[PDB]
Design a protein around this ligand. Sequence first.
Ligand SMILES: [Zn+2]
Lengths: 100, 156
Amino acid sequence: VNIPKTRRTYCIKCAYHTEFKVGLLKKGKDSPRKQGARRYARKQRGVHGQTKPILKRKAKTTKKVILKIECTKCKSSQLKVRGRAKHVEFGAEKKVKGEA
Amino acid sequence: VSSHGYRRQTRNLFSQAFRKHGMPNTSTYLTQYAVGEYVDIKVNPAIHKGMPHKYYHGRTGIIKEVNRGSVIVLFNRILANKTVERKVIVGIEHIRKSKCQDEYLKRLEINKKIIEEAEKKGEVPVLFKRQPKGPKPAVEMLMNNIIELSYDKVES
RNA sequence: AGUUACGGCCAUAUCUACUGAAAAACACCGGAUCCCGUCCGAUCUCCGAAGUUAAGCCAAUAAGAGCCAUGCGAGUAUUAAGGUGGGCGACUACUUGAGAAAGCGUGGUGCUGUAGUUU
RNA sequence: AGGCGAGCGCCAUGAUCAUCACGACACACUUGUUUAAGGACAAAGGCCAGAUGGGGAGUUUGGCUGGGGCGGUACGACCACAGAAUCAGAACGUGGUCGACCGAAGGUACUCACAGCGAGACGAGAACACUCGUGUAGAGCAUAAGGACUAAAGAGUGCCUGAGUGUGAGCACUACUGCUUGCAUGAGGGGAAACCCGGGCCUAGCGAUCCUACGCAUACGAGACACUUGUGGCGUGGGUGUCAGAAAAGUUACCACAGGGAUAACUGGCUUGUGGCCGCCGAGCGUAGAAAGCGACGCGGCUUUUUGAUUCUUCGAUGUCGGCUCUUCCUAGCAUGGCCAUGCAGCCGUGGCGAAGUGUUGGAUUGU
RNA sequence: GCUCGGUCGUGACACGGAGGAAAUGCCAGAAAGCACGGGUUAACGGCGGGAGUAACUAUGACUCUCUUAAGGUAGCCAAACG
RNA sequence: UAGGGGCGAAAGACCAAUCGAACAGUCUAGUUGCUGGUUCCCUCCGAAAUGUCUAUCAGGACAGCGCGCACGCAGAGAGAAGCAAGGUAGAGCAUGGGCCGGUAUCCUUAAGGAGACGGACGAACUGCGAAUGUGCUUUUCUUCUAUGCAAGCGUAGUGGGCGAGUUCUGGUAAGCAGGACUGGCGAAGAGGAAUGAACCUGGCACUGUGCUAAGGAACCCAAUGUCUGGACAGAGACCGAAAGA
RNA sequence: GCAAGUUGAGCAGAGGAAGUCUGUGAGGCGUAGUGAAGACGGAAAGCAGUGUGAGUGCGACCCGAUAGACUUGUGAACUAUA
RNA sequence: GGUAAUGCACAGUGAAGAGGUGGCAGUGUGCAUCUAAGACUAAAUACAACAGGAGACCGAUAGCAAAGAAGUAGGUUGACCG
Ligand SMILES: [Zn+2]
């Protein structure tokens, strides 16, 4: 699947159509200071073994394509969801018809 | 085993009749509908928006609400041994005006005359009910021109 | 009464040969300077009247093909209810009811709405 | 505080604190070398942290199934067939498909067809490019199957990113999911305009609570006030295919317990494919000649003595193969008695009929 | 599997470093192991297929071909192992 | 030398008639979706063995079918009369699949091929199309109806079914395995088929007199005789095929 | 029984007394809802008892495992070995 | 219950004379409230043996195991059992 690097679309904050910059969303790093991390650290602490379950019988191959789009004027962001695909490319050459 | 998609088992239903393929006729689009009319569903397979589920094909119901190019029709259905009302959205290409009230409306037109006179002259209407066909009538016959019948045909 | 513009129901209107047609139309027809579009003024777009009923459109003809109706096929095929009916079965007779199709014969061959024009 | 290369890093040595070997003493510590020998090492204790660890400890080792196991997946989805013409409707019933793919194969406006067949046109042939006439789809429509489509939904050509943003109501047995439809908005798109568009012509391509990542504004914050961290709310992603969602390998012939004829290993019952026995027909063969004796290719039966198929009875128990011993019954007749046919000279036979009274043995190898 | 040698890399806590008002984080550091190179079967164990070819026929000493960590030697056999 | 321990010329042998983990006592009345049992009378009403989800298949929960209390009340497991939808039985072989033979004529060969046509066919072929069954409106439409219906609230049992008639799928079949429709036995006695869960007649408080059903009427055993044809086989009343004199 | 209200909380005063009568006097639920919250606000008789059907937890209708653990409890008079 | 530590310990480290706390981690600053690392204390509260009084309790297969010479007759190698 090929996606262009730019898209003119409606910006909710500006309340009219504007140019946006287009790219794949990126998963950030887990923080030790959140309530879930704190709870788990304390529970693991003693001689208690493994205290929470871990998935082993996994089954899926792909994961869902998700695009982050940024408004060039006001820097606000929107998230667009596009379904499952094994491979993604940004800004490659057009699928020109009637090749040799 | 069978499957359970939205258009399961519709090979015979949802197919055009012989020498009747193509889009609908102008009369379909120029018919005006109103709340409270009785209407009859027959799906046109060539139109892919506003199709009802195939249970409703060939059933008749009553118009509840009217929109730009679609209608909402009320139906009743038995589920788990109880009666349930159902509100079905249909596009105007898949409906025709029902004939089921025709005779009753004629009878009302006759009643509407009598019920006025019944205030002036009588006290109660005669009301013009239908009656089922009675016994066989009496006959007077001239008795010339007799025809005899016989087992002449041997039927080898 | 036809035609023509815009229609309704979508073959009684289709397909193949032939033949007719006052008037007014409808056409074929004559050019590309411009607007517009082509490998190509063939098609599409524009500007025109020297010609012509040869064509189309309209109408007639044909033991024509196809379509539409009706009669017959036929109370035939199949079928609902019933009995301590029959048959080793496969299946089938009877009593009170409902009731076809293909073939084949005979007839048809568009009907109409609103406006405009022509003895 | 010195020196090098167009104040930089690089090369010299001079002051300031830890610090690793090596020596030489004896004071901790060690040893019945004890009025002694070793010596800050050893050996022995303590607190944290990595590695190894069936030596042990706990526990687990899905379901459906013509009994279980091995095999398949009827375990989540989609089309067609059948189920005596609404809808629904079982079996490890039938023919198949799915866990994706695509900036166009998405949205709009306009133009024109196609597969073939009959004539033509140098090289040029069965099969090269160009034309004329016919052409209801005999073609195409990415990917199963069905349905749909003709001045198009197919093939080309132009422009666009609606594969917008808030918030309602409903349909499929309706939670998740998929689709249909209302109102409001965009310094939205395509088209002259009427019209159409919030993915793919329609029916399939998918996933809760808690935790965590990101986007969006509006909240909270402990006696008070400021900031760095944190906690709330809505929406999407990260995943459970056993697909309405536990974190999981074997073996027991040393074996235990609760139950089951809801379910196997005998017999019996129903069935008779397979096993065995009998009829019908007459192509050919028999030295001539269908039929003394045979009888291809086909067709109809009977039996329960073989082995299957099924699970009705028994799992708080019906003692399981063969032999020994002893009795009775059946006939589809091997001998013995009476007869008929003959390819019956006689002798020996072969095919059939009524008949179950009396007979049908001794041994070698082998559990048979 | 056991055993021997070196690090070239990885690999804990402590001990340091930079920054910030401070917490939390970040960076360095890092034995033995692991990786890497050798030894070892009276350690666990393991030890092949296909074609042609000799003056009757058969059989193949001989040839070619695929393959490996090595392709079952000396003996023994329808053996309590066919 | 003592129990997750001993001892063993090794058999999981032996450790007070106990050993593939001793005895005593306690926690403890451990747990059980599994087996057994569960104590007086009469009156009235009366089921289910099906759907969805479940580490679910000998169990649960939700819904469906009972009963009790009942605010209230024009309704109905039947017909007519207008109106819709359907692709089965029959019938056919016009698109698609597909068997055998063709006159004239045509094409070549001097073979064969095509053919104006006839016969034979499909669960996944259709050009036509029933009966029976399904839904809508009308009491302004016959006929019944209070000793009747009944929202709502609370709560039970059930979730192994089996059989007849008519039909269907798998299988050589089966008292075999699995669906659909209308009544049964389950939970149903009485009279009849000699006997039999389900077949025929026909639904049960307690007495008395009459009458009929189904099935019987020489005798067993309450009631029996008549007329007309067939039939001779230790036949038939109870009973098997193709083939035959 | 009382009703926009209601109640035997504990505890005090009286009384030849485990009864009864009287006080003082909390709390709880109700008198109207909406949101996570900041915040806002606009329908519906309740409270306490005496009993019956029914759910959940405790031995939980009655009887019934093979097993698991704990003791500063016992045993080599049978049998094993020094 | 105590949630970026409610209390108690062990090893390293280790104060100030001024310190501790104000149910969410950190740094600063006012405000409120207390004074740890030494000791003693009545009343109102809990419950066997033994004694006394009561009861909608049981009545010799019941009620404590035991209404008489009952933890007895009797039993285990023993602990213990009855
Ligand atoms: Zn913006």
